[PDB]
Design a protein around this ligand. Sequence first.
Ligand SMILES: [Ca+2]
Ligand SMILES: [Ca+2]
Ligand SMILES: [Ca+2]
Lengths: 150, 151
Amino acid sequence: GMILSAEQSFTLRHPHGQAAALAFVREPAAALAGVRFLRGLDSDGEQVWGELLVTVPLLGEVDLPFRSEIVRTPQGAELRPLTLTGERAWVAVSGQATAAEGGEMAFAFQFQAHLATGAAFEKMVQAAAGRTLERVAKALPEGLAAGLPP
Amino acid sequence: LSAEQSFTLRHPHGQAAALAFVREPAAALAGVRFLRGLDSDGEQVWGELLVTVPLLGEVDLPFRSEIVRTPQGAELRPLTLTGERAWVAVSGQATAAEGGEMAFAFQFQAHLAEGWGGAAFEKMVQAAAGRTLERVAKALPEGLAAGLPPA
Ligand SMILES: [Ca+2]
Ligand SMILES: [Ca+2]
Ligand SMILES: [Ca+2]
């Protein structure tokens, strides 16, 4: 299950404190936008959406959309993925974030690729999809850190 | 990676109407299928064709064409899109003659962007794209006819 899913967890301190940390984690479209491998980030305050790019031979860059519900929690926020239609591949982006007193933030993100429904062809697509999920996951800390004041 | 279609249809309202019909994409292409997201600003027409492959499902290939008004009708002349992803060049020529007799010709070209994995991928993508081009080309007469009003 590690090919079509990725996981990333890390911490960052918000230098302006808990209130600033809470606000930061509660506006995901803006925070996620710093991750370059996420494209077309947008939000209406209730949900956030965008796309990941999977590069394959001949077709080139293939966009897989995602859309998640923004849930405000007592300690921060969560992203809960919405199920998209099955006619093309898509991604489920899940996340949990907390802000402690002093402004230290804890992040956990999970990505699941949902492919549409020979063996050689499937392995190539799955490999390309997996590389994309991992590239986004590994880039999350840098991306969120870019949205913090120095 | 190419598909062609040519055919004739009579516009029930005569020549002037046939000229007007072929010169306005919103009229001529109103009932055309397999061109998703079709839109136009009067200068260009654009949309996408869907190539279905396993696991990725429906992959959209965009096209954009310039509308050119001619003495007997109009043409679509394709614009070059980037190589970052597969795309389609949609060309077409239409003429309206005495009595409302219309002639159409359309041409489509799909522009695509090692090992067992790579050989399997190429085979499946070329075949799928070929099917997409033929499906849209073969349905064009039906689609154009669907845009025509009764006498
Ligand atoms: Ca993984
Ligand atoms: Ca990991
Ligand atoms: Ca697309």
